[PDB]
């Protein structure tokens, strides 16, 4: 029994037909080089991801949504211990500067997309419960709030290739498992199936950056803060940004409504935690301003 | 379309056969007059609730487990604003003392059971992820810790009858909906399908006790605290207290594994929040010592 | 020169004609044995106190207002250091039990009235700025929230006689001055012109109960908390509960508008600080439950 | 009726004779391009502002006093949520960099002066109550502390022109009223009669920077902090830095003493709050170190 | 090698001659049934303990000192997690009510003495460094404050018999060692050489009451708070309450002065930590009011 | 009598023979230009310093140890008030830029070495109590953690010359005494026998930097944090990094064991406090990134 199993989901390479188009539309609409694990997991269910994504799309594609993710991102620093810079440690492992930069770019890309995924998951979860995810505000978006951000990945960004956990070394599986468990999560975030090609670094990240704050009041309060930012932000959308499960009862069985309810709630927590975690990983390299900047859609 | 939907679940009256026996075994083993909403929802899926319960039962029937629930309960007070006693407000609504005592008894019974359900859900959720829910400790429980508590509901305690949301008044549905949404929950806890026969009280409870603290750092920090207590405590069990989803892959589909993962996580949060909420409601009548006492299994 | 001046105000014995009736209606509507210092100072301006009181009266005379004052009272404990009971020191000074009880009664009366005066001053100040002090809520008060509390002082309560500061001893003056200055106030609260006939007690109270928390984050946070409570609570009034200065410009000169504006604001802070202070004094004798109880209008 | 009234005051253009001299002396002694709103309101009273200012001037013109204002400035950052940079948003509204820099300069000027006005108001308020604002210390100021700062506005700085609220657009009135009420203030600070020529920016500032922290414990603790710094600081002046109201009773009536007492207290809070607000506004553009720097009198 | 060593000290039974008189004088002046471990350790050095006690005695025997120890005691509760009552566990282990009361009496005795020992050690340590421990205050103590408390142990109290650690069971050594190391202390407090005859209880106390808070911010802040209370309090003594090491250089060697400096500082911390610990143990039995009461010298 | 005494210790110039070798080995192993005051004082006892240093040396000379001290250093900022930069005061006093840089360099040297001395004293103290200082971690250091940092003082660094306190001016004695007593220390840290040649600066530092945070919760929590960092970090050492007193009983007398136990505990606190203090002094010149950088051994 391997250390880490593969969690059930429609992996990037498994999406077919319309769901594959949805995955690509998520990548391009959100300008992110991976489809979040929440999506991938929930995409195993009929209808919901496509439907919810269709509602979210026009709302998440705007500058207003982008500003909300930026607010999330800016607010994602944990007032925790100060971390040492992993750079010298990676240099001591003989990583080149180019390799460290590849890691830093991967962190940046994750730190760009995760806050947008907190917007996404918030919109999906809140709308699932008929809570406010747009359309209720008296004033529609004005000025350039309503404008669309660019479509597609930013230049020079390619899609991530998430490592195959079953194929991964025990070391990779172990650190992904440790990171998972340190935060009482259910699986390694996509971020770690990205970063987990460098389990040497992830072990440093876990010891220096993540384990010291996992499950702490300060981390949880940061998550609370950013979840609140996301939740408030989506109320400014011009139209609802997900689908209500009570509207889905012809498309989904009771059992699927229950599972997706759980999943939506768990992922709303998970994305906020992962948003913080990877920002904190970049913060160790750089500092909070860099790690929370919007480096892609400005 | 009504204010509040019925969330999918196996309601107490719907359980049949071996699941009805599990439900009764839960009532009797935990000494609680209701089967928690998370169990009722999760019991729509095959295998899991029966199998997890079978693992949990010998753990949760011990005095050790009971002390863990006591520790949760004792630590469930939110360091929030001081609440006014609802008693005079109920007396102004013309409630008799008897009727007020009926409500206080209901709160006491929920306050007894909820922390045990936090142990339950923590055990289920952590075990599902192969995290520590027993059997790893240096030695077995002994002494007082190992003794089973009594089986069955306490003297004078009968099962609660949860109200049927579909049949409830708009006022009842509204306050259950408001209480659900005040905490960003997915449905009304069983507690409120109990207390919701008194929506005039629940409106006061929401106003006075719950709304002022819902989503607040103080509340969420209390939930973190008691979740941590429960999570630490189950490590003391003599044997694992749930099932791991990687052991359930012949019983559950990928989709059900994902749904149950979500559910377990959501309910591990939900039960903590509700434990705190109904303790807070009793605290308003009484104070923290009474609201957090173990009144039933000493 | 004495260390303490008499601050300009219409003292209880100086009010005449309609203003005297207003003072008495304040005593009797609020069931308090003193007209608060803010009112007595603001009463030297034409119009405002009578006009603002007229607006407030029907709102402050209700159970709803009384519950708001209770919510303030209940939340007025500072999370500060634990205080010793002054009783032994007073006994050792030869105070009789009777006199200690006279002092405790005086504290209880002040602690009854002060939260209601915080509602009063908050309504006045908020309304002065056209902020919400009633009438905007969609739902009017329902049930018995709208009922009047009894008119007049509670049985066995007589009006306080505030000491004449000019005639007071140096020791009374000094401790009132010291208490004023410890909190950066402008004058001794009425409370201290009542309690300051016992300056030996006030010196103990200053040392034990007030000085250690004056100006602290804990005190000021308590004050913020009860100010907020009052400010929120007055929005529930059925009609606005003061007058707007922009509606007073035929009755008040610019200079008077400016002075009253400052006075309103200063007294909105003063009354919250004093509410906390005298509650804290009683808390040293008893404890927070007793010191924050509504002992008069239930 | 207008959304916003003009509050009674001697506006810049209304001061005549000796009071105009005083205004100019305040501009030049403090090196600020506006006479604070507290001064302009209080200047409608005879004697007090000239008399208080005469006492304060030799104290506030010192480098010691400047250091105090620097300490206030450096300590005015609220440990609140992180704010997005308004720069992109102003660029989206088509503002040139030049115009943005004009706004940043105006914020800088406000941020320079407001801490000094907190020294001023603290001196005035504490001296009014005969509390320590100088002359009680062991040593007189000596060395660098004693040197007068430059007189006059800094190079390239011209006096601000405060917008006429009666002539302002509804948009400007609305945002000034919103900012006023967000902090439970009595009128728009001078700062907003300066910045309110850009109501598009002030709407951003209110949503991004001010509203999220208004009335919060963090803001109010910041204010407590800087009020304290100022209050401690002025004890180091060589002689009292204001006038006591007990010494003013031939110059001011009882009513005016009461009005000024309120106004002083209200402005001592107002000016701290506005100090923090406009520093926070600059912080959103440029960070806490830039926002809290002394850029003018070094 | 045993689990626990006996730390060097002049144990109660080893003190001879004038040092035995000093020990008895400490018992009788402080009204405590043990000479604290700090004194016993420091009493191995010549002169210091007799001299410093001579200075302290007239100061600590006063009601003013007693009131200081009461403020410490009252402020020694840690705002930690809520503890279960150990009573049921002890009952289930077959302790009798009488044996439980014997333990509760022991805790009460300890909780009476330890605050006074924090006065003692504070006075010693601060006086060692020529810091203020009396004689600098404006007034001599007058009145109640100056009165000596009674001399001798309270009615019904006899001296404790501290267990001989070398003769103790491994179980007692172990729990003493664990309690010592949980708080990074150097040895078991006298309290645990009292309570360690019930190592069953101390194991419960360690798991339930002490480990959860040891080395925590809350515990350390409690200790800071009470250390501060003692340190402020001894400044009100009429004359210095220890000896300065610079006045002991004919009595002590450099090495002894260094050693005693370290011991005094260590015990200043130790006694505050133990004060809190044993109060917290009694709190688990009863509650903070009982655990912090002065039950012996009123 | 002078203001400040010289505390008993083997000063740098006093160490002879093997102890002088140990002092030089400390300098060179830790790359610090002074032997800490704790070492100097404890070196007056036989055996302990040489023995404990022998155990610590191979552990403290590693990159792992250095990363520990870096973690300490980076976490040493107190979340206290923002400080003004002393530079303008020093320039105004006629300090030259060169001199200010000599000061800044001294601070940087101290800030490099103090965190390492906290590792040192922590190892010594915890080992003295048989607590974990190495050799118990399942995994030995790997990679370059085990590698030696360079031996010797960093290029361009010479030993500090600590001032002779007996020969110092009253001004230097006074500021050293004030700084010692502000923190309730026993003597001036080596840092102030270095910096105290500039008492003008230390007076500014005490006023601007140290006094406002001494004894505060924020300071002491920072110290608790860094002490915990150090204490956890030494457990990662490959073998124990000091000597247990129970292994020293042939080499030290009971009185020396007691004194050293006290001194070790006291210095484990002292070094933490001094670490934070000098970092805070450099932070006033620069900011937290600079003041907590490792400028010497990277």
Coordinates of C-alpha atoms in Angstrom, one line a residue, chain A residues 115-282:
Chain A
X115 CA -7.1 33.3 -5.1
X116 CA -9.1 33.2 -8.3
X117 CA -10.1 29.7 -7.4
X118 CA -11.2 30.8 -4.0
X119 CA -13.4 33.2 -5.8
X120 CA -14.6 30.4 -8.0
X121 CA -15.2 27.9 -5.2
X122 CA -16.9 30.6 -3.1
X123 CA -19.2 31.5 -5.9
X124 CA -20.0 27.8 -6.5
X125 CA -20.5 27.0 -2.9
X126 CA -22.5 30.1 -2.0
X127 CA -24.7 29.8 -5.0
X128 CA -25.3 26.1 -4.3
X129 CA -27.0 27.3 -1.1
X130 CA -28.8 30.1 -2.7
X131 CA -26.7 32.6 -1.0
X132 CA -25.6 35.9 -2.7
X133 CA -23.3 35.4 -5.5
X134 CA -24.4 38.2 -7.7
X135 CA -27.4 39.9 -9.2
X136 CA -28.7 41.2 -6.0
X137 CA -26.6 44.4 -5.8
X138 CA -28.7 47.5 -6.9
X139 CA -25.9 48.9 -9.0
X140 CA -24.4 46.7 -11.7
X141 CA -20.6 46.8 -12.3
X142 CA -19.6 50.2 -13.8
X143 CA -16.4 51.8 -15.2
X144 CA -14.0 49.1 -16.1
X145 CA -15.1 46.8 -13.3
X146 CA -17.2 45.0 -15.8
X147 CA -14.5 44.6 -18.4
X148 CA -13.1 41.3 -19.3
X149 CA -9.6 40.4 -18.4
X150 CA -7.6 38.8 -21.2
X151 CA -8.5 35.3 -22.2
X152 CA -5.9 32.5 -22.2
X153 CA -2.8 31.9 -20.3
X154 CA -0.4 34.8 -19.9
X155 CA 2.5 34.8 -22.4
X156 CA 5.2 32.3 -21.7
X157 CA 2.9 30.3 -19.4
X158 CA 2.2 26.7 -20.3
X159 CA -0.2 24.4 -18.6
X160 CA 1.2 22.6 -15.6
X161 CA 1.6 18.8 -15.8
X162 CA 0.5 17.4 -12.5
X163 CA 2.6 14.5 -11.4
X164 CA 1.0 11.1 -11.3
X165 CA 1.0 10.2 -7.7
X166 CA 0.9 6.5 -8.3
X167 CA 4.0 6.8 -10.3
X168 CA 5.7 9.1 -7.9
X169 CA 8.6 8.1 -5.6
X170 CA 7.9 7.2 -2.1
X171 CA 9.6 10.5 -1.2
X172 CA 7.2 12.6 -3.3
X173 CA 4.2 10.6 -2.1
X174 CA 5.4 11.0 1.5
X175 CA 5.8 14.7 1.4
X176 CA 2.5 15.2 -0.5
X177 CA 0.9 13.0 2.2
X178 CA 2.6 14.9 5.0
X179 CA 1.6 18.2 3.5
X180 CA -1.9 16.9 3.1
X181 CA -2.2 15.7 6.6
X182 CA -0.5 18.7 8.2
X183 CA -3.5 20.6 7.2
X184 CA -6.1 17.8 7.7
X185 CA -6.7 17.8 4.0
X186 CA -8.1 15.1 1.8
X187 CA -5.5 15.1 -0.9
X188 CA -2.5 16.9 -2.2
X189 CA -3.5 20.2 -3.9
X190 CA -2.7 20.5 -7.6
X191 CA 0.0 22.7 -6.4
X192 CA 1.8 19.9 -4.8
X193 CA 1.4 17.7 -7.8
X194 CA 3.2 20.5 -9.4
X195 CA 5.8 21.2 -6.8
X196 CA 6.1 17.6 -5.9
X197 CA 8.6 17.1 -8.7
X198 CA 10.9 18.8 -6.2
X199 CA 10.2 16.9 -3.1
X200 CA 13.5 18.1 -1.8
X201 CA 12.1 21.6 -1.8
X202 CA 8.7 20.5 -0.6
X203 CA 10.3 19.0 2.5
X204 CA 12.0 22.3 3.2
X205 CA 8.7 24.1 2.5
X206 CA 6.8 21.8 4.8
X207 CA 9.4 22.2 7.6
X208 CA 10.1 25.9 7.2
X209 CA 6.9 27.3 6.0
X210 CA 3.9 25.1 6.3
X211 CA 4.2 22.9 9.4
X212 CA 4.9 25.7 11.7
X213 CA 1.6 27.3 10.9
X214 CA -0.6 24.4 9.9
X215 CA -3.9 24.3 11.9
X216 CA -2.8 27.3 13.9
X217 CA -5.1 30.1 14.9
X218 CA -3.2 32.5 12.7
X219 CA -3.5 30.3 9.7
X220 CA -7.1 29.6 10.2
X221 CA -7.8 33.2 10.8
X222 CA -6.0 34.2 7.6
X223 CA -8.2 31.6 5.9
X224 CA -11.3 33.0 7.5
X225 CA -10.3 36.5 6.4
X226 CA -9.8 35.5 2.8
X227 CA -12.9 33.4 2.7
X228 CA -14.8 36.4 3.9
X229 CA -13.2 38.6 1.3
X230 CA -14.1 36.1 -1.4
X231 CA -17.6 35.7 0.0
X232 CA -18.3 39.4 0.1
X233 CA -16.7 40.0 -3.2
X234 CA -18.9 37.7 -5.2
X235 CA -22.0 39.5 -4.0
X236 CA -20.8 42.3 -6.3
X237 CA -21.2 40.1 -9.4
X238 CA -23.8 41.2 -11.8
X239 CA -25.5 37.9 -11.9
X240 CA -25.5 34.7 -9.8
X241 CA -22.3 32.9 -10.2
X242 CA -23.2 29.2 -9.6
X243 CA -26.2 27.0 -9.5
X244 CA -28.4 26.2 -6.5
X245 CA -28.7 22.6 -5.7
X246 CA -32.4 23.0 -5.3
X247 CA -32.3 23.8 -9.0
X248 CA -30.3 20.7 -9.7
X249 CA -32.6 18.1 -8.5
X250 CA -33.4 16.8 -12.1
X251 CA -29.7 16.6 -12.9
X252 CA -28.4 15.2 -9.7
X253 CA -29.5 12.5 -7.4
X254 CA -30.0 13.1 -3.7
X255 CA -26.7 11.3 -3.1
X256 CA -24.9 13.5 -5.6
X257 CA -26.4 16.6 -4.1
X258 CA -25.1 15.5 -0.7
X259 CA -21.7 14.6 -2.0
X260 CA -21.3 17.9 -4.0
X261 CA -22.5 19.8 -1.0
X262 CA -19.8 18.3 1.1
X263 CA -17.3 18.7 -1.7
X264 CA -18.2 22.4 -2.3
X265 CA -17.8 23.1 1.4
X266 CA -14.6 21.2 1.7
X267 CA -13.1 22.8 -1.3
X268 CA -14.1 26.2 -0.2
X269 CA -11.9 25.5 2.8
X270 CA -9.3 23.7 0.9
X271 CA -8.7 26.4 -1.7
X272 CA -8.4 29.0 0.9
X273 CA -5.9 26.9 2.8
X274 CA -3.9 26.2 -0.3
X275 CA -4.0 29.8 -1.4
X276 CA -2.4 30.7 1.8
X277 CA 0.1 27.9 1.8
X278 CA 1.6 28.6 -1.6
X279 CA 1.7 32.3 -0.9
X280 CA 3.5 31.5 2.2
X281 CA 5.9 29.4 0.2
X282 CA 6.7 32.3 -2.0

